[PDB]
Design a protein around this ligand. Structure first.
Ligand code: F42
Length: 276
């Protein structure tokens, strides 16, 4: 599948730069602006509308909604509105919800891993029954979550890191091979209809990728330098090397929809120049 590139921006209360940041994202060649769903961050659909008003080409996506925060019927209303009032520029990523303290602040039951996945399941089923027109993305590496992506999603988002639900450990390329294979088995005949996404956490420009990886072992002692150079959540090297790495990872994992974090927007833009 042809590459699509996204940048995960954080619309921040009290910071007046949102419109400017969105314009920079488009001008730098990104295809998607992604926004998160967290307390203390601007509300995602409202921020996406503000982004749509200053950009003409990018898609806008949630990355990802906390399913506990949304009534499915009211979310379907929001998704139909965002679709119609942007001319079809909105996609919605959904997840189970990550931060317990946020559930508690909003007066919501954290429950169990099982109840949080069931909530996602119930929302996806409802959104499909209501025939929402926004493309749907499902993010997470859990068996049940990837099963839900295989059943319901237009895009599956694989996480390149694990964390205790309640900082982040990066997962090896070999564990990623297994997660993509798991997804593919669950998707069956629908596998080829689902776009595969991943979020790159760090984009490290360097003329010595090998020396960089060796130094980064201190942040990741459970891995060798060779493993670090294959981690899907890291891009290390020159832009040409990063482009070749992304080509190799599209072949290995199927990752064609690659997002980076806001802090790396300019660092990664040369790679868009080479790949497009
Ligand atoms: C928690 C996570 O599970 P997951 O299926 O990958 O993800 C579930 C949700 O977090 C996921 O659906 C999303 O809500 C998370 N999410 C966001 N969630 C949000 O709520 N808002 C966001 O803006 C958001 C952004 C986002 C972006 C990218 C991304 O990859 C995920 C994002 C995980 O790390 N699982 C690990 C660890 C599971 C584990 O072993 N847990 C232990 C350790 C915890 C303990 O000590 O008890 C246990 O439960 O006992 C694994 O599958 O191996």
């Amino acid at each position: 599948r042809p590459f699509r590139f996204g940048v995960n921006l954080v619309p921040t209360p009290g910071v007046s730069s949102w419109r400017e940041t969105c314009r920079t994202a488009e001008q730098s060649g990104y295809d998607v602006i992604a926004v998160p769903d967290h307390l203390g961050v601007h509300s995602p659909f409202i921020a996406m509308m503000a982004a749509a008003a200053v950009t003409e080409r990018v898609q806008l996506t949630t990355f990802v909604l906390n399913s506990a925060f949304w009534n499915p019927v009211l979310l379907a209303r929001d998704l139909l509105t965002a679709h119609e009032l942007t001319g079809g520029r909105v996609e919605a990523g959904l997840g189970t919800g990550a931060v317990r303290a946020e559930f508690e602040t909003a007066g919501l039951d954290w429950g169990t891993a099982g109840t949080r996945v069931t909530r996602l399941a119930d929302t996806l089923a409802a959104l499909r029954t209501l025939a929402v027109p926004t493309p749907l993305m499902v993010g997470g590496n859990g068996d049940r979550v990837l099963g839900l992506a295989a059943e319901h999603a237009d895009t599956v988002s694989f996480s390149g890191a694990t964390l205790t639900p309640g900082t982040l450990r990066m997962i090896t390329a070999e564990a990623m091979d297994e997660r993509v294979a798991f997804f593919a088995e669950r998707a069956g005949e629908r596998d080829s209809q689902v776009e595969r996404n991943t979020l790159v956490q760090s984009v490290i420009a360097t003329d010595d990728r090998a020396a960089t990886a060796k130094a980064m072992r201190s942040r990741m002692p459970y891995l060798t330098a060779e493993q670090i150079l294959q981690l899907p959540t890291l891009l290390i090297g020159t832009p040409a090397q990063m482009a070749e790495t992304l080509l190799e990872r599209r072949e290995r994992f199927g990752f064609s929809y690659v997002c980076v974090q806001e802090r790396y927007l300019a660092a990664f833009a040369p790679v868009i120049g080479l790949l497009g």
